[PDB]
CSV table of C-alpha atoms in Angstrom, one decimal:
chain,number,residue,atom,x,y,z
A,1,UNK,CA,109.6,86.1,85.8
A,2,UNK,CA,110.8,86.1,89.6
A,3,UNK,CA,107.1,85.7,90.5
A,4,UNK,CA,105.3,84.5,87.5
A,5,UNK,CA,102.1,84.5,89.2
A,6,UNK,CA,102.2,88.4,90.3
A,7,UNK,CA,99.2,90.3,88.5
A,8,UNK,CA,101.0,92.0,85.4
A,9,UNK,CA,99.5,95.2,86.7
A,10,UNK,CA,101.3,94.6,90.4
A,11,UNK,CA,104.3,93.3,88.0
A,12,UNK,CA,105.5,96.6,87.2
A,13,UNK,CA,105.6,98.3,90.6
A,14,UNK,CA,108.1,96.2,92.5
A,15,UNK,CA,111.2,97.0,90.6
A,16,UNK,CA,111.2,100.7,92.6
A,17,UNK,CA,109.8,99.2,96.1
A,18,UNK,CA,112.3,99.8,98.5
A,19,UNK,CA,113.8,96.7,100.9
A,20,UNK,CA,112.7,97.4,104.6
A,21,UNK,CA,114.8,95.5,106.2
A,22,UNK,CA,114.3,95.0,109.8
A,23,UNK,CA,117.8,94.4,111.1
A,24,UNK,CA,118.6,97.9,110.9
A,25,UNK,CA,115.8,99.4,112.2
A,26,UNK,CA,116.3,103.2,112.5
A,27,UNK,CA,116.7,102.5,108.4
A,28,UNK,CA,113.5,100.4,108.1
A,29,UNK,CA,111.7,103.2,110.0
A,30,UNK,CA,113.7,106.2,108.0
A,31,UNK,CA,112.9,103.9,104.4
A,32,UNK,CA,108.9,103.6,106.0
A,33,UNK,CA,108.7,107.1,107.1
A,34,UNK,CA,109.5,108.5,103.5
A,35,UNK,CA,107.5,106.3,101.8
A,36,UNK,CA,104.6,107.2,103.9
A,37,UNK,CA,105.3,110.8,104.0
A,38,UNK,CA,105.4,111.6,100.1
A,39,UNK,CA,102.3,109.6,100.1
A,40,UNK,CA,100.5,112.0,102.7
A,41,UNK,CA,101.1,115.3,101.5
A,42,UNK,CA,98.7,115.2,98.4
A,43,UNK,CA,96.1,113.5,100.2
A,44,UNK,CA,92.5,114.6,100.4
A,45,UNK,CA,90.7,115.4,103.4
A,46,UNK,CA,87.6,116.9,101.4
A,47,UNK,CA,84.4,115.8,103.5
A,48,UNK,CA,85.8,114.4,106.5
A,49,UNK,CA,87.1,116.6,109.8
A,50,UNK,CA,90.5,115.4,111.7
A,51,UNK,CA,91.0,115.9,115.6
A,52,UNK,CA,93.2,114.3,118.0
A,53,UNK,CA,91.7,112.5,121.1
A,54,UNK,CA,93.8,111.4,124.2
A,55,UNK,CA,92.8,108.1,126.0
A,56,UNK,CA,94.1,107.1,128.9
A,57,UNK,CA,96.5,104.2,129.3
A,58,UNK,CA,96.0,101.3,130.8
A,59,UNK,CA,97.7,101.0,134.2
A,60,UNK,CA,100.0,103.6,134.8
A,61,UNK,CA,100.3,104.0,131.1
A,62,UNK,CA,101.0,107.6,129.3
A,63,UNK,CA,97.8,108.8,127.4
A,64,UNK,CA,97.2,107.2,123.9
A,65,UNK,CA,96.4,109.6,121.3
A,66,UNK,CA,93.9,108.9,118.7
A,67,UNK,CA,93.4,110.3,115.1
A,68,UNK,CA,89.6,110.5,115.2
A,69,UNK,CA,88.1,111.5,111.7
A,70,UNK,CA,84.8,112.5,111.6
A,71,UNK,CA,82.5,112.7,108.3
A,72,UNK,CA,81.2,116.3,107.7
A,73,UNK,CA,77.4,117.3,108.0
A,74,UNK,CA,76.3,113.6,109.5
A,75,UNK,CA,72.9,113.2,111.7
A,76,UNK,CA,75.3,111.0,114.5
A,77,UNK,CA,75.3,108.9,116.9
A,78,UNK,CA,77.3,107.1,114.0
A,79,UNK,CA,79.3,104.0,113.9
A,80,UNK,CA,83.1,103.6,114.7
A,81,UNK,CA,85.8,101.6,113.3
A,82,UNK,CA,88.9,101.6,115.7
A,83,UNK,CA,91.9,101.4,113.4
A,84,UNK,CA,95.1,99.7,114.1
A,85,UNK,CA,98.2,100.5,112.1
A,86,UNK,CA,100.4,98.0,110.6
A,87,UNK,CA,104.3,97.8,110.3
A,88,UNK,CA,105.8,94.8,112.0
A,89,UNK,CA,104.9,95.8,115.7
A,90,UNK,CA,108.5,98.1,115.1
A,91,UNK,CA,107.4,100.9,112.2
A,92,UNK,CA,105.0,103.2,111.5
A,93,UNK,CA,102.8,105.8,112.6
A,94,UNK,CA,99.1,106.4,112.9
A,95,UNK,CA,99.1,109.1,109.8
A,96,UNK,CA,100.5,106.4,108.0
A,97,UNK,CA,96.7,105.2,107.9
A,98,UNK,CA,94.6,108.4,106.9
A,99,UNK,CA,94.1,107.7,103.7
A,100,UNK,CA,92.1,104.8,104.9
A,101,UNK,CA,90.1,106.5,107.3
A,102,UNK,CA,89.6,109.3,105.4
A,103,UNK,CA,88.3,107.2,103.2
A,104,UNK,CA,85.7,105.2,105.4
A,105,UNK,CA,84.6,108.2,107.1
A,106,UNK,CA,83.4,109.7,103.6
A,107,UNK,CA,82.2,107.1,101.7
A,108,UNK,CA,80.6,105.4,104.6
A,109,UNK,CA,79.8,108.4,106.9
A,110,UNK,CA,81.8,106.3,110.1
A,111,UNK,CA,83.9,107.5,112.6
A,112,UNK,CA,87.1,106.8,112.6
A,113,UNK,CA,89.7,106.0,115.8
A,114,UNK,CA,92.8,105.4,114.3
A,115,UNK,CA,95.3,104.4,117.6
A,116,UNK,CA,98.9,105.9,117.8
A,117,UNK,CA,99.7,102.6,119.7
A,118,UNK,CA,103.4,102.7,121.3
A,119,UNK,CA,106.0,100.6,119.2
A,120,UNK,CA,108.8,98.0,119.7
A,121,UNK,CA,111.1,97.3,120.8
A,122,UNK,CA,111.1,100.3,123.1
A,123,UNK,CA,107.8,99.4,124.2
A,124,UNK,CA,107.2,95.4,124.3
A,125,UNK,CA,104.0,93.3,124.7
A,126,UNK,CA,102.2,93.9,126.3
A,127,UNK,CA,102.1,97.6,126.0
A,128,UNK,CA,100.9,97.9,122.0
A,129,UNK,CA,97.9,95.8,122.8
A,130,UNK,CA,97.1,97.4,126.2
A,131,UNK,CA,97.2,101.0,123.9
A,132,UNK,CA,94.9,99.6,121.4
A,133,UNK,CA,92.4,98.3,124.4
A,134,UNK,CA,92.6,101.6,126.7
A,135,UNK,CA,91.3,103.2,123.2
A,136,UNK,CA,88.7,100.9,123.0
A,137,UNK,CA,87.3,101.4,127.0
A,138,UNK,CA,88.3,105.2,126.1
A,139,UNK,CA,86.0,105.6,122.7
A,140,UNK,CA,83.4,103.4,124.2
A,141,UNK,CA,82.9,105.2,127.8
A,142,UNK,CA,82.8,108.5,125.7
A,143,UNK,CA,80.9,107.5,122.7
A,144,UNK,CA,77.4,109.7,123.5
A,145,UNK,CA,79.9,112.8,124.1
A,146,UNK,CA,81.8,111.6,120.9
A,147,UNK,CA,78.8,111.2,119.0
A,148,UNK,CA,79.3,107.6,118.5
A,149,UNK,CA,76.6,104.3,118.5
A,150,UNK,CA,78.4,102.1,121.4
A,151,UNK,CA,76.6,99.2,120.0
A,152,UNK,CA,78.1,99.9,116.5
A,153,UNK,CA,82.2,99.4,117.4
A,154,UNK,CA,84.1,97.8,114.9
A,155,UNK,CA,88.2,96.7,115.5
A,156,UNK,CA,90.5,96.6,112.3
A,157,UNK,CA,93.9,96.9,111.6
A,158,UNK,CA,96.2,95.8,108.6
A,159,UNK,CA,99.3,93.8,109.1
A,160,UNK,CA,100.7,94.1,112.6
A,161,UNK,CA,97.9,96.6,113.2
A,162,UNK,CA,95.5,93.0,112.5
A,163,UNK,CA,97.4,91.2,115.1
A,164,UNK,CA,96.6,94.1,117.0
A,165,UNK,CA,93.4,94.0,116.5
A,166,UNK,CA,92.9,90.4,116.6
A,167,UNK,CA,94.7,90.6,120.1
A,168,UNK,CA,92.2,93.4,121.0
A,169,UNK,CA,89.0,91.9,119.9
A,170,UNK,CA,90.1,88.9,122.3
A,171,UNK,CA,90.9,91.0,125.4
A,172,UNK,CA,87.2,92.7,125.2
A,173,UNK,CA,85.7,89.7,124.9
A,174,UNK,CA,87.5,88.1,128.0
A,175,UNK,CA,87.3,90.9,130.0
A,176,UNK,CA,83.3,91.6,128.8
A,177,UNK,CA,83.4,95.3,129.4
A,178,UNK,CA,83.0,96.2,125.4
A,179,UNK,CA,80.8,95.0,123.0
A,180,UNK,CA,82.6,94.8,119.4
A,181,UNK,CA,80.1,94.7,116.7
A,182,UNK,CA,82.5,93.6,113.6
A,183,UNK,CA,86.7,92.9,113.6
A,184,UNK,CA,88.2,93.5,110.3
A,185,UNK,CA,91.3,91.9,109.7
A,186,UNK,CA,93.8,93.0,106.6
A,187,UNK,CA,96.7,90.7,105.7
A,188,UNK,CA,97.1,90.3,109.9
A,189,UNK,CA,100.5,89.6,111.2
A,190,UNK,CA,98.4,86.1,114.1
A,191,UNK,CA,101.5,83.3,114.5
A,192,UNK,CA,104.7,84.0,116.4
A,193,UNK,CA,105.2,80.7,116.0
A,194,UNK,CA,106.1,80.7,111.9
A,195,UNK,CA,105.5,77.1,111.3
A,196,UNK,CA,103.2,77.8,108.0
A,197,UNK,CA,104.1,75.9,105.0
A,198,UNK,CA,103.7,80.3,103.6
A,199,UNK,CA,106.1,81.1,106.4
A,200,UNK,CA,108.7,78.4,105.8
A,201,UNK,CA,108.7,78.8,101.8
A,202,UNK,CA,108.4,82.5,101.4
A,203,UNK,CA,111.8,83.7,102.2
A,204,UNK,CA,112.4,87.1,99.8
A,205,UNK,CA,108.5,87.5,98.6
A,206,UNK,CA,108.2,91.5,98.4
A,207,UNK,CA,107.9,93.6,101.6
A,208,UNK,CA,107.5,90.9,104.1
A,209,UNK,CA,109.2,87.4,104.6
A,210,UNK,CA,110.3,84.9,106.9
A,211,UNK,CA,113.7,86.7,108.1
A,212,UNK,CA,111.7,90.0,108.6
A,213,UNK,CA,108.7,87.9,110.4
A,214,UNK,CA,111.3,86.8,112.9
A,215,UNK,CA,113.0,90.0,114.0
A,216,UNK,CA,109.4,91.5,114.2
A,217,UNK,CA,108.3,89.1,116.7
A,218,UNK,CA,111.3,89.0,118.8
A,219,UNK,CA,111.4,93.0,118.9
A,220,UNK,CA,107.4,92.9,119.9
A,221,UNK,CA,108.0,90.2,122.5
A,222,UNK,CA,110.9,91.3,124.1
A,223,UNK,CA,114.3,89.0,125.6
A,224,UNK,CA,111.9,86.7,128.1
A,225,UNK,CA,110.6,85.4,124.6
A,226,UNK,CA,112.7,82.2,123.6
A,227,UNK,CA,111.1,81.7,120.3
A,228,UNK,CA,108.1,79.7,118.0
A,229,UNK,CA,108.7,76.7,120.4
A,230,UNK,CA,108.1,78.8,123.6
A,231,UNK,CA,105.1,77.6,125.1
A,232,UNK,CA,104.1,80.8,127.0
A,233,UNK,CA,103.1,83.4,124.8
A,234,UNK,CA,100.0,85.3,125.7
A,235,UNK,CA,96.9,84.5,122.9
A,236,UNK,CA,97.0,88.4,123.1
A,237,UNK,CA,100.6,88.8,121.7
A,238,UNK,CA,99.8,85.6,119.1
A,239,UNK,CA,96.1,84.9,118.3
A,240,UNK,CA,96.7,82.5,116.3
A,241,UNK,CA,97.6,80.4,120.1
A,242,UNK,CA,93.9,81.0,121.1
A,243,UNK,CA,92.0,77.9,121.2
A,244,UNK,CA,88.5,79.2,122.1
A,245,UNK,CA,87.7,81.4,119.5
A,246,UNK,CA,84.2,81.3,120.2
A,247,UNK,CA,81.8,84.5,121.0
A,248,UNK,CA,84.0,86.9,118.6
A,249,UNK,CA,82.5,89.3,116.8
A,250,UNK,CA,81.4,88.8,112.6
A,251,UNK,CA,85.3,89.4,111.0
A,252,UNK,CA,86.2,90.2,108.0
A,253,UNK,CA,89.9,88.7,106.8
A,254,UNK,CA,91.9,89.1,103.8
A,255,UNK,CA,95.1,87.4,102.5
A,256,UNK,CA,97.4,87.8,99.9
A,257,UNK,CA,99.2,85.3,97.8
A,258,UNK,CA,102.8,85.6,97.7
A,259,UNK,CA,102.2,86.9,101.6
A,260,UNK,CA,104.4,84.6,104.4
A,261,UNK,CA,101.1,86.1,106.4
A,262,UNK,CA,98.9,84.2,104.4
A,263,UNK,CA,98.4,80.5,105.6
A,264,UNK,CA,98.0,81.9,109.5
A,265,UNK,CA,95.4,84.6,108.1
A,266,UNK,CA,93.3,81.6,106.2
A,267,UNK,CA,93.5,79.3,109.1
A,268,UNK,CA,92.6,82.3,111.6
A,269,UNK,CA,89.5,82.7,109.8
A,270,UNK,CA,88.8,78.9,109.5
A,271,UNK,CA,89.3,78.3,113.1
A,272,UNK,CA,87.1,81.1,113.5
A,273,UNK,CA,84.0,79.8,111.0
A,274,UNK,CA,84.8,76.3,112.7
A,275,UNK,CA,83.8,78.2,116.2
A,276,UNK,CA,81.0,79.1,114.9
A,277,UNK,CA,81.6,83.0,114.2
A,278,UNK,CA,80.3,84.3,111.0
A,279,UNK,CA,83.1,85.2,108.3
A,280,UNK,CA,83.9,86.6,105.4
A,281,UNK,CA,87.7,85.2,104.2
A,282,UNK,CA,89.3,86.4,100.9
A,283,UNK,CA,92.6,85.3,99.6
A,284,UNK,CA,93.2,87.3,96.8
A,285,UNK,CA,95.4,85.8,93.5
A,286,UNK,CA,98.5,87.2,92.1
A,287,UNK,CA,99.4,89.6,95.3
A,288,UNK,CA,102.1,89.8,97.5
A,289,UNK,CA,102.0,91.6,101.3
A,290,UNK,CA,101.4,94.9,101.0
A,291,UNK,CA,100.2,95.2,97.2
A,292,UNK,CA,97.1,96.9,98.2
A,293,UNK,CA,99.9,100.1,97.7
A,294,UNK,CA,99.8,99.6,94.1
A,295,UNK,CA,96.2,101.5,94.5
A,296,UNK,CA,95.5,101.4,90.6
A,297,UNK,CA,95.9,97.9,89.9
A,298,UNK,CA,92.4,96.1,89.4
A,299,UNK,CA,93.2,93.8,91.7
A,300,UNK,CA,94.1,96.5,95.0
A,301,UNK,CA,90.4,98.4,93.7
A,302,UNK,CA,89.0,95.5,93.9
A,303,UNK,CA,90.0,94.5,97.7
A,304,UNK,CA,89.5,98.1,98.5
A,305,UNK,CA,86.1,98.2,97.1
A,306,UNK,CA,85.3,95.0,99.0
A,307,UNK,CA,86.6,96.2,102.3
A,308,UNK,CA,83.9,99.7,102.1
A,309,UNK,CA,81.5,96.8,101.3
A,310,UNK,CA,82.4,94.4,104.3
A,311,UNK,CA,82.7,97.3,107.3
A,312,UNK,CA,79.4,99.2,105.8
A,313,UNK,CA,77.6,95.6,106.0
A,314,UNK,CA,79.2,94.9,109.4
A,315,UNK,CA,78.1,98.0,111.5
A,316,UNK,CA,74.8,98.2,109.3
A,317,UNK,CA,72.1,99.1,112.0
């Protein structure tokens, strides 16, 4: 009866869910690590190959490295979804995401990039995006040699790993080296700037909220960042500041309910239909940030299902 509109079946599941509290970080990463890592060790990899690719970074960068799944026994040159991991811009690691790629590269017979992208603080904008970018020039100068279609490159990400992306998707087209076919957007962390009627009224929803929403941008933007009313923050960092979103590539974004994320995700993809981009937008009922976890509820299948569905359609030949 907290949150009366919560699907019964995502009800259960949040009396054990851990706080990840971001003013303690080495705990929010220890608390992150060990709920990903119990996760892991059962999971399948039946199908699908797993090797690790090292792109170069951008300017004098070090080397990104890339979890690149493969589908087993496939005719190639297939398509490629470059995958962006989520976690605030502060936590989480690229394995954190295998299920999902394990899971698109079998059931949909796609490669898979998934980007060990540098986190913050330690690293601050705009390093993370400039990781996720150097493995987009990296997978697309290689793709004949990595048995990849260069016309068929899709960006994605979930959560941070969406602003990420979103950021990512924005660089290529401005600097017009790679084409991106499809950008597929999961509950994506857009709007430093956290004027949302979501972001001022969800203050203790599960997982994510307002007083995590503002650590995580001030560790990803670093001490020459003053704040939502700063005016100079890079459309990169924030897409959600972009005002030409024209020329972007056919997106895919979903939303959750009880997510301070979702208002900036629904008007992200409206700004992006009003620019004339073709999009598919789904705010899904009775969810909260992160409840695609809950992998059994109807609900979670349902916008798993839905996300095969959208990145099959979008790299379709």
């Amino acid at each position: 009866t907290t949150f009366p509109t919560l699907d019964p079946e995502l009800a259960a599941a949040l009396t054990m869910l851990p706080k990840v509290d971001f003013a303690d970080l080495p705990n929010a990463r220890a608390t992150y690590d060990a709920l990903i890592g119990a996760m892991l060790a059962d999971l399948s990899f039946d199908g699908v190959s797993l090797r690790e690719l090292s792109a170069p970074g951008l300017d004098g960068d070090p080397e990104v490295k890339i979890r690149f799944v493969t589908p087993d026994n496939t005719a190639g040159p297939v398509p490629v979804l470059l995958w962006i991991h989520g976690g605030g811009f502060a936590i989480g690691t690229a394995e954190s995401s295998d299920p999902f790629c394990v899971e698109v590269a079998r059931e949909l017979g796609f490669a898979v990039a998934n980007v060990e992208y540098r986190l913050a603080p330690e690293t601050t904008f705009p390093g993370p995006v400039n990781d996720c970018y150097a493995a987009l020039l990296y997978i697309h100068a290689h793709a004949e040699e990595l048995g990849i279609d260069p016309s068929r490159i899709a960006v994605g990400g979930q959560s941070a790993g969406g602003g990420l992306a979103a950021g990512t998707v924005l660089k290529a087209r401005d600097e017009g080296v790679v084409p991106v076919a499809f950008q597929f957007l999961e509950i994506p962390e857009l709007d430093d700037r956290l004027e949302t009627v979501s972001m001022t009224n969800f203050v203790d929803t599960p997982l994510w909220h307002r007083p995590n929403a503002i650590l995580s941008w001030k560790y990803y933007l670093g001490e020459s960042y003053s704040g939502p009313e700063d005016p100079d923050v890079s459309i990169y960092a924030a897409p959600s500041r972009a005002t030409d979103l024209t020329g972007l590539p056919p997106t895919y974004l979903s939303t959750m309910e009880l997510d301070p994320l979702r208002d900036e995700g629904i008007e992200y993809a409206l700004r992006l239909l009003q620019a004339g981009v073709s999009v598919e937008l789904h705010s899904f009922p009775g969810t909260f940030h992160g409840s695609a976890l809950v992998a059994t509820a109807a609900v979670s299948e349902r916008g798993a299902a839905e996300a095969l569905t959208a990145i099959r359609r979008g790299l379709r030949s």
